[PDB]
Write a protein that binds this DNA or RNA. Structure first.
Ligand SMILES: [Mg+2]
Lengths: 93, 275, 152, 1106, 210, 158
RNA sequence: GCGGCGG
DNA sequence: CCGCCG
């Protein structure tokens, strides 16, 4: 199946939650540029004809692989609705 | 689908309907008909007279008519068992309310009256399984329950407070009225109601949201009456909310998670820097 | 409904056997509907139809077994239910062994040929005693027999 | 190749003319081949005399009906959309009460369709079939009462439909009931009306039934005779005149309602035998002398009192007994509508007898062809009974040419009432194949008829039986009526006979649908052959005796969907009818008389008979079948050859050597592969495609019309407003596309031009045209392009310009263009094949000969059938065919095994043994022994119990081959497959299921104008429906957006679908759908009418969708 | 009239059609009205269907899909990736490039197979009966027309291989894609919602061998 | 593993149990030809005769495979959760015996043959009634179009 | 609209 | 139920 989906499911209080998180994080991956990751140094996802999956394959793939590590935080009401999209564009070319 | 506990935000309603429907294809009273008869509060072919009174039994035999008498010290519920019926309770022992005095199927309504609701429910559920079981099918009771429960989500009114008698309204909507009639605002104007057993079809028929009603029943009347009283359709349920094209109240649409946010420790300290 | 301890036992056991058969037929049914590979074949209609022929026999066994009387009368004189009769044909000296029982107990396979209560030959014998002589109709004609005796 | 057949039941008489049902029906229908002199006056003529002596005094009488000059010929009718009809007039002469009889010797009133030599008709360009029909044979019967288990009721059924439907019930608590049109009245009442007086009546009638007390019931109305006739009128439900308006009574006299079916046998049959005995006239018909005679009414009650009483005979009528069901031959169906037309015509001719001036009226004034043409026309082209001839392959056509349906006029039988009729009844024996019915809804309702089953004088499907007096069997046969079959004791044909005498004491026979073991002295009749028990179609399965009836059906039906393969091969193992099917069906062309061959062109064969004659037979080259299949005739004779009378001159679409062939015989191993033959998958060897083993030719007929708009006639020319020349190449002929051209999806097949955006020139497109080139042809490009999917090679073209030779060009239609496109269908992965036993399946993987299962000697197999599909389904027959088929390979011989009499297990092992000396015999000499591989599998075989331990590998393998299994090395590993595997020559076919019809793949395209839906129809395809069943499916999943996506982004949100498309183009993340145009459209639809539908916020406030 | 026609007499266009002009009421109710529109549903963009064929090798994770179809199915997505790689200078070029199949650059395939990487599609059986009537699979481009389907899920969708045909869809939104492969992928729905029993039960062939 | 007409082995005792039942039928006949058993009882006892005889032959075949051909293709298939159903196997090796008439009342005579051996003309024809009545069900019962899934969805869809 | 047909 | 042809 998928890389430690069980581990993932364990990280959420409800199944469907994981999806929502998974998704929105895949969005922020492309929108604010594709360099907005947290685990690019070693073991960043990869592809087979030319090791280029380092630039742009699947988004969700990343999200999950990122969520698998204790880097990202997810919550009901973590950051002020609008202040988040403002600060993101600022710190990301 | 998994094995751990059900995740909040799952279209159980659906799931139940499906699991119970698929099987329907191989059930040819004996068979599907019975399942219909069962989901639809009805008077089956072979009716079996239930005992409205809970006492003991005594029988009088040999004559064009046989009579089974549930008797106690004060009264006996005379039961006329035609010369062509088959009874299996006999001259002597006790019989609870709503107990098969005749042989065969039972009638929900009567059974609701005598024994009560917690029995009708349990009766349906089981009398349902009874068929699929005999047909190889193995479906969890859960689902038979989910459905059946909706078959008694409505209740009539005998004691009025805000609305008039002769009403047929949502069981829970009444627990809100009576809860806030005794609790918050004083004056105990009890809202005595009578649990109401409705077939699956008529439960749908008389549903509460107007959007939903607009689909099947007459579209004229539904909008007419919803017009008069500025009805506010609180969007809950998949049908109604579909029409809007909005996100389903269930699934990923679950109010529980439709709102969740993601952060990278770098942006969390960055929001703290905006302070 | 009238049964002999023997009769009872037999019908009780048969019922047991048919329960095992129903559980099997069921298992089978379930597998078919689960297969959904080859539909529209005599896979369902047969499995089903088979299970039915069973359940039916079961309803007949439960009915009869749910309300039958037991007549413990091994010491009696006139042919009644449970009585084992023996008839000799005056002419050929043929010895015929039979036992009259309720419709549900009839069975030509038994030691004494168990004949139905409401069975012609069954009717003819009830109410008579050692010595008597009686007739009934038969395709070849009509043969009278004499009750030589009546064991328990 | 030698042909051995193993039949031991002496087939006494040859099968009958298979299409006889249709053929003869129409012959006897319109007795148009012989003079008005010949007797046979049923159908046309009969329906003529029925309503020809018109007595309005007006007297128009019938003379002779003649017709015969076919407007045009067969194919012309097809090439031009013409209905192949003959012209029909008839001499009539109108008489006057004054002196004078003008005879207008000819009034052509209609054009009736004709019948091909094969049996089909050609209505409008296409070939159709008039399928036979069944119903309750208009007679009289007695069926048990509905709910009341007590007594039974009497029925009196007459057709046509307008005629009453009488019933006679008796409810002792107060009435004797006679119902006509749902109202009950005193059975007596009518009786009196006729003359039957209380006294005479009751005494001869109430001999033994106290019930009669129920008739002598009138001590008040029963004392007034002719007054009761008036009394019965009162009875009519509506207020009308007491006297003469006895019309309603007149109606049940001798003309319209009761039936005018042939006097003596039509109804009378159900009379004489079933009840009473004589019929004066035709039906309870008599309005003569002022007094009426109903030698019918009393006996019907006479049998009611008999039935309810004693045993006059055991009168209880089993509805389905074919002795009470008739089959409506085309002739009857057609003749039916004909007299309906006759009536409609006579309707207006009486009107024109009063409008009459004087003696000056005859042809014109009396006759109007209007009614009769619309009539007939309507049948052949509108009736739910004549349809598109299923010609997937000849056999197909032939079945569809002979099946029986229940649904129809509606008076016979409907849809929701059938559990009872659907059953194959006792009587269907040799009259209705018990296997020919179709799966799914409509089962047992529509079925093909039996082998020898032939329709008699009045429809009851008769079957053939052999007479047998004493212990002797004759060569004399009689076609019994279902009913008459019950009177006797017939015996099976499997019964051993030493020549003309029975063979065993305890021999099988069936009394009345009841299995009984009878004695040689009691056998009065014996079965002709097992064949008669099933249908032609069924009679084609090799070892049917070993195949479950349920799957056998799939098997029979399957053959009907077989497709014409270029290389046609007859079954290595046949039933014995293959020859005939092709014969009686007209696929192949036979030699009329003895003689010699002259010319053997690939287009025509000209032979010279020895009788001083020389004919030219043109061969339909490559015609387009109704289903789109190749139909060519390949001569199988050489120049100058002495031909035997009735010898194949050329082979038909699927018949080679005169045998029916549909698919080919391939070597097959019966075992499991990785999973490529999982559920019902079939594996195929590239090696098949190589020798073009499974290749069907196909044709699609695209068509376009040059319509005449009031905006400007649409011209068909090489000119296309969009300026491209590279796409104009193929379209060489000014307007048409060149024959032999390769047309791909999106190419122009034909060019056409019509006028602009309706009425007015666009003021926005007048500035764009003027900037780059004002002189731009104002005409638009509306051209018949290659519809997405495919086309192939253009092979024939048809154009119909102005000066029409003899074609019916619809109105507004300037000229028509037809384009026939073909291609080669090589077998590929998605294609589905199947064997005559019912094993159906699709090709899963096409394997390279390289690594597929091969035998010791280099020979690889062709296909691998998964074994697992054989146990559940019960069709051993195939595993059998395979065994025999195995001998056939090495013995190089085809066999013919009869239905129930075919080859037997011992005899096959016998030929198999022979086969071992060919397979292994050459092996010994060629100079080599046994492989270490062969030994190894033999070990596992002996430990398996297949071989007898202790014998020589030689011996062993033989015994192992005999079982029908040989050894087989993998091919991929070259390692054997532990355990013998059975293999052989199995006859399998490709079905009318190309995957050509299987892959609409949509990205983007057309939307409906009124309703926002991605409908297709052009170069673009439709998107699959999502239905609610499927939404729930999604809902349960909690697939929010996946569902949102379906409802909006992919369908209705015009603007939304847009953003999405763009986004995807940008490699971006699709936009968020805000409001479905359905939401907003609802708000408005609700605003448009009273109701203010207002959307609200958190805190009950406004929000804008717009 | 414009409110509800027919309630009292019926308005007709002048002599030509004695058909009641579809009124507002008529535009809302009925078998095929408007309140019944958004529900019964309609046709999906980015769809397709074909005959199904068993894919032995294939893992329940994946599903066999015909490149040809993939192409069309994923046309837009492909287009973009076309520019990302010099196979084309612009979007319209990519398209003209693909309008004619004789010239399928071998590089395009690389692209298509590149755009599909980790995306999945959905599959549907003839009568959609239970939630598993549609599962999600990772497509792996294959030869031919038929669609390769994993054996183990054959039980889920009442589906055999005697010519049955399934439809296939594509989750466009990265949110749809997600839920698709998370809570809708095959390998994730092993147990049946009907009974806690497995639906990935090994079938006839497998068992037999085992 | 593969099928071959011989792989469907007929148990030697079939010829026995059938014989045992056969004569047994005679007794029942002789008994009514004397007048002992009623018109009905005759019937029911005979069915009982076969109902058991058939069941007997069923375990017989199985016993034959279990003891002599543990690795029989036909057999193995059925044992393994692969394919096959005991009832079916019986129609192969032993015999399918009781097929009912049009209405419902099962047939008096049984289908003495096995599929291995050639099912007789009549036996087949008689067996027909069943298969047709079976397809009948499927036609009505299938096209019901999972109506309940629809009706069920209607109430619990919220 | 009606016939046919696949699962 | 879903689908397709004429
Ligand atoms: Mg199928």
């Amino acid at each position: 199946a998928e890389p430690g989906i069980d581990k993932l499911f364990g990280m959420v209080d409800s199944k469907y939650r994981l999806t929502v998180v998974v998704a929105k994080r895949a969005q922020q991956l492309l929108r604010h540029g594709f360099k907005n990751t947290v685990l690019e140094p070693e073991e960043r996802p990869k592809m087979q004809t030319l090791e280029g999956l380092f630039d742009d394959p699947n988004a969700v793939t990343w999200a999950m692989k990122e969520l698998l590590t204790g880097r990202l935080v997810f919550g009901e009401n973590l950051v002020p609705e609008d202040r988040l999209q403002k600060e993101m564009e600022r710190l990301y070319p | 689908s998994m094995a751990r506990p059900v995740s909040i935000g799952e279209a159980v309603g659906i799931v139940a309907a499906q699991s119970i429907g698929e099987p329907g294809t191989q059930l040819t009273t004996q068979g599907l008909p019975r399942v219909i008869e069962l989901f639809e509060a009805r008077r089956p072919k072979a009716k079996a007279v239930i005992s409205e009174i809970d006492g003991v039994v005594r029988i009088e035999e040999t004559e064009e008519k046989l009579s089974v008498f549930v008797e106690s010290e004060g009264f006996s519920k005379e039961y006329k068992l035609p010369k062509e019926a088959r009874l299996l309770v006999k001259d002597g022992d006790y019989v609870e309310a709503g107990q098969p005095l005749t042989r065969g199927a039972i009638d929900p309504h009567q059974l609701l009256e005598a024994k009560g609701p917690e029995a009708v429910e349990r009766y349906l559920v089981e009398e349902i399984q009874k068929v699929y079981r005999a047909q190889g099918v193995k479906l969890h009771d859960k689902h038979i329950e989910i459905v059946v429960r909706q078959m008694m989500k409505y209740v009539e009114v005998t004691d009025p407070g805000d609305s008039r008698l002769l009403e047929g309204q949502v069981l829970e909507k009444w627990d809100v009225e009576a809860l806030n009639e005794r609790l918050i605002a004083e004056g105990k104007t009890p809202v005595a109601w009578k649990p109401l057993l409705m077939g699956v079809t008529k439960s749908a028929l008389s549903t509460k949201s107007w959007l939903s009603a607009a689909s099947f029943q007459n579209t004229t009347h539904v909008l007419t009456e919803a017009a008069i009283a500025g009805k506010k359709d609180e969007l809950i349920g998949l049908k109604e909310n579909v029409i809007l094209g909005r996100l389903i109240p269930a699934g990923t649409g679950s109010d529980f998670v439709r709102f969740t946010q993601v952060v990278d420790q770098k942006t969390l300290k960055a929001i703290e820097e905006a302070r | 409904v009238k049964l002999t301890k023997a009769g009872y036992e037999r019908l009780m056991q048969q019922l047991e056997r048919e329960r095992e058969r129903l559980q099997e037929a069921t298992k089978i049914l379930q597998e078919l509907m689960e297969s959904s590979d080859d539909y529209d074949d005599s896979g369902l209609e047969a499995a089903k139809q088979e299970k039915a022929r069973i359940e039916a026999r079961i309803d007949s066994l439960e009915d009869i077994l749910s309300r039958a009387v037991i007549l413990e009368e091994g010491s009696g004189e006139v042919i009644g239910l449970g009585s084992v009769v023996e008839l000799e044909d005056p002419l050929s000296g043929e010895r015929l062994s039979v036992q009259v029982v309720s419709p549900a107990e009839a069975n030509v396979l038994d030691t004494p040929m168990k004949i139905s209560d409401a069975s012609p030959m069954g009717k003819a014998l009830l109410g008579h005693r050692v010595g008597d002589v009686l007739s009934l109709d038969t395709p070849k004609g009509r043969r009278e027999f004499r009750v030589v005796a009546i064991h328990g | 190749m030698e042909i051995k057949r193993f039949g031991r039941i002496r087939e006494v008489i040859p099968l009958p003319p298979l299409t006889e049902i249709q053929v003869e029906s129409y012959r006897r229908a319109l007795q148009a081949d012989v003079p008005p002199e010949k007797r046979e006056n049923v159908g046309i003529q009969a329906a003529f005399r029925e309503t020809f002596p018109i007595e309005e005094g007006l007297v128009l009488d019938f003379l002779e009906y003649r017709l015969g000059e076919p407007p045009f010929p067969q194919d012309e009718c097809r090439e031009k959309d013409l209905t192949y009809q003959a012209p029909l007039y008839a001499r009539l002469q109108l008489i006057h009460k004054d002196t004078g009889l003008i005879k207008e010797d000819e009034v052509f009133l209609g054009h009736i369709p004709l019948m091909t030599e094969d049996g089909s008709f050609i209505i409008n360009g296409a070939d159709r079939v008039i399928v036979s029909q069944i119903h309750r044979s208009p007679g009289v019967y007695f069926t048990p009462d509905p709910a009341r288990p007590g007594r039974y009721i009497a029925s009196i059924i007459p057709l046509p439909k307008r005629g009453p439907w009488i019933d006679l019930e008796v409810e002792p608590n107060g009435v004797v009931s006679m119902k006509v049109n749902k109202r009950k009245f005193p059975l007596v009442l009518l009786l009196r009306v006729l003359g039957y007086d209380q006294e005479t009546l009751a005494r001869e009638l109430g001999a033994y039934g106290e019930l009669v007390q129920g008739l002598m019931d009138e001590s008040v109305f029963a004392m007034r005779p002719e007054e009761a006739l008036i009394r019965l009128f009162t009875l009519l439900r509506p207020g009308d005149p007491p006297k003469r308006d006895k019309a309603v009574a007149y109606v049940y006299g001798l003309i319209a309602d009761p039936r005018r079916y042939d006097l003596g046998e039509a109804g009378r049959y159900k009379a004489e035998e079933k009840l009473g005995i004589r019929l004066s006239g035709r039906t309870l018909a008599r309005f003569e002398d002022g007094e009426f005679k109903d030698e019918v009414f009393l006996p019907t009650l006479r049998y009611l009192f008999a039935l309810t009483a004693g045993v006059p005979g055991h009168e209880v009528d089993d509805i389905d007994h074919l002795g009470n069901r008739r089959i409506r031959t085309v002739g009857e169906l057609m003749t039916d509508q004909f007299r309906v037309g006759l009536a409609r015509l006579a309707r207006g001719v009486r009107e024109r007898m009063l409008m009459g001036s004087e003696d000056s009226l005859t042809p014109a004034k009396l006759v109007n062809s209007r009614p009769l043409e619309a009539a007939i026309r309507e049948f052949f082209s509108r009736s739910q009974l004549s349809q598109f001839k299923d010609e997937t392959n000849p056999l197909s056509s032939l079945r569809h040419k002979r099946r029986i349906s229940a649904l129809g006029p509606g008076g016979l039988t409907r849809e929701r009432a059938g559990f009872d009729v659907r059953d194959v009844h006792r009587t269907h024996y040799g009259r209705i194949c018990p296997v020919e019915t179709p799966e799914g809804a409509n089962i047992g309702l529509i079925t093909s008829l039996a082998a020898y089953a032939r329709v008699d004088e009045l429809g009851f499907i008769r079957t053939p039986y052999r007479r047998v007096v004493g212990g002797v069997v004759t060569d004399e046969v009689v076609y019994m009526t279902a009913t008459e079959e019950d009177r006797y004791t017939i015996a099976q044909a499997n019964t051993p006979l030493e020549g003309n005498r029975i063979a065993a004491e305890r021999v099988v026979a069936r009394r009345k649908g009841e299995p009984v073991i009878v004695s040689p002295e009691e056998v009065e009749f014996m079965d002709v052959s097992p064949k008669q028990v099933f249908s032609v179609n069924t009679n084609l399965i090799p070892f049917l005796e070993h195949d479950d009836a349920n799957r056998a059906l799939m098997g029979s039906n399957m053959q009907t969907q077989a497709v014409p393969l270029i290389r046609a091969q007859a079954p290595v193992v046949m039933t014995g009818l293959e020859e005939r099917v092709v014969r009686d069906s007209l696929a192949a062309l036979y030699a009329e008389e003895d003689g010699e061959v002259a010319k053997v062109d690939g287009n025509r064969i000209v032979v010279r008979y020895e009788d001083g004659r020389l004919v030219e037979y043109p061969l339909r080259r490559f015609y387009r079948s109704n289903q789109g299949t190749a139909l060519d005739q390949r001569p199988r004779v050489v120049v100058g050859q002495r031909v035997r009378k009735g010898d194949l001159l050329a082979d038909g679409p699927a018949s080679e050597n005169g045998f029916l062939a549909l698919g080919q015989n391939v070597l097959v191993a019966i075992m499991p592969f990785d999973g490529y033959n999982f559920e019902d998958a079939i594996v195929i060897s590239e090696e098949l495609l190589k020798r073009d083993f499974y290749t069907s030719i196909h044709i699609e007929r695209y068509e376009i019309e040059a319509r005449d708009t009031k905006l400007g006639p649409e011209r068909i020319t090489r000119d296309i407003p969009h300026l491209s020349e590279a796409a104009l190449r193929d379209l060489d002929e000014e307007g048409v596309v060149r024959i032999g051209a390769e047309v791909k999806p999106g190419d122009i097949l034909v060019g056409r031009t019509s006028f602009k955006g309706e009425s007015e020139p666009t003021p926005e497109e007048r500035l764009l045209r003027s900037i780059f080139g004002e002189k731009a042809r104002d005409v638009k490009d509306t051209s018949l392009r290659v519809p997405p999917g495919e086309g192939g090679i253009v092979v024939r073209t048809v154009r119909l310009r102005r000066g029409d030779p003899g074609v019916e060009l619809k109105p507004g239609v300037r000229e028509v263009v037809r384009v026939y496109v073909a291609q080669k269908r090589k077998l590929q992965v998605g294609d589905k094949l199947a064997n005559r036993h019912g094993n159906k399946g699709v090709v899963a993987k096409i394997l390279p000969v390289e690594d597929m299962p091969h035998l010791p000697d280099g020979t690889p197999v062709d296909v691998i059938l998964n074994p697992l599909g054989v146990p559940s389904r019960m069709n051993l027959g195939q595993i059998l065919e395979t065994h025999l088929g195995l001998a056939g390979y090495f013995l190089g011989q085809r066999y013919i095994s009869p239905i129930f009499d075919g080859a037997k297990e011992p005899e096959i092992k016998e030929l198999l043994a022979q086969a071992f000396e060919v397979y292994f015999g050459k092996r010994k000499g060629e100079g080599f022994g046994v492989d270490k591989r062969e030994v190894e599998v033999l070990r596992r075989a002996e430990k398996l119990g297949l071989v007898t331990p202790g014998k020589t590998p030689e011996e062993q393998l033989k015994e192992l081959f005999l079982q029908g299994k040989v050894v087989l090395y993998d091919g991929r590993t070259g390692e054997p497959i532990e355990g013998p595997i059975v293999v052989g020559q199995m006859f399998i076919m490709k079905l009318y299921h190309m995957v050509e019809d299987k892959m609409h793949a949509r990205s983007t395209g057309p939307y409906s104008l009124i309703t926002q839906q991605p409908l297709g129809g052009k170069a673009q395809f439709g998107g699959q429906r999502f239905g609610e069943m499927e939404v729930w499916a999604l809902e349960a999943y909690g697939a929010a957006h996946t569902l949102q996506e379906m409802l909006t982004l992919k369908s209705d949100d015009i603007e939304g679908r847009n953003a999405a498309y763009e986004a995807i183009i940008k490699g971006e993340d699709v936009p968020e759908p805000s409001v479905p145009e359905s939401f907003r459209v609802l708000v408005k639809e609700l605003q448009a009418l009273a109701l203010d539908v207002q959307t609200l916020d958190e805190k009950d406030n406004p929000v804008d969708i717009f | 009239a414009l409110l509800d026609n027919g309630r009292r007499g019926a308005p007709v266009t002048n002599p030509g059609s004695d058909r009641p002009l579809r009124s507002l009421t008529d535009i809302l109710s009925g078998k095929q009205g408007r309140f019944r529109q958004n529900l019964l549903g309609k046709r999906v963009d980015y769809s397709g269907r074909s005959v199904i064929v068993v894919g032995p090798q294939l893992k329940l994770h994946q599903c066999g899909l015909p490149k040809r179809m993939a192409l069309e199915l994923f046309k837009p997505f492909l287009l973009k990736k076309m520019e990302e790689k010099g196979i084309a200078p612009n979007v319209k070029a990519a398209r003209r490039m693909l309008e004619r199949q004789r010239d399928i650059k071998d590089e395009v395939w690389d692209a298509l197979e590149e755009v599909i990487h980790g995306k999945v599609v959905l599959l549907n059986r003839a009568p959609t009966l239970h939630r598993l009537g549609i599962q999600a699979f990772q497509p792996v481009l294959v030869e031919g027309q038929s669609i390769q389907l994993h054996p183990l899920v054959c039980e889920a969708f009442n589906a055999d291989f005697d010519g049955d045909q399934m439809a296939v869809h594509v989750p466009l939104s990265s949110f749809a894609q997600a839920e698709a492969r998370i809570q809708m992928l095959s390998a994730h729905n092993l147990l049946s919602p009907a009974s806690g029993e497995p639906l990935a039960k090994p079938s006839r062939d497998i068992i037999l061998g085992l | 593993i593969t099928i071959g007409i011989d792989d469907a082995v007929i148990p030697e005792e079939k010829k026995q149990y059938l014989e045992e039942a056969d004569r047994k039928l005679l007794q029942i006949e002789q008994a009514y030809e004397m007048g002992f058993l009623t018109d009905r009882e005759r019937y029911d006892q005979i069915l009982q005769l076969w109902t058991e005889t058939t069941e007997k032959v069923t375990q017989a075949v199985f016993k034959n495979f279990e003891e002599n051909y543990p690795f029989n293709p036909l057999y193995v298939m059925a044992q393994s959760g692969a394919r096959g159903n005991p009832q079916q196997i019986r129609q192969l090796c032993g015999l399918r015996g009781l097929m009912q008439k049009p209405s419902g009342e099962t047939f008096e005579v049984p289908v003495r043959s096995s599929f291995r051996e050639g099912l007789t003309v009549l036996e087949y024809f008689i067996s027909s009634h069943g298969a047709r009545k079976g397809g009948a069900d499927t036609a009505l019962r299938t096209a019901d179009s999972g109506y309940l899934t629809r009706k069920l969805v209607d109430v619990t869809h919220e």
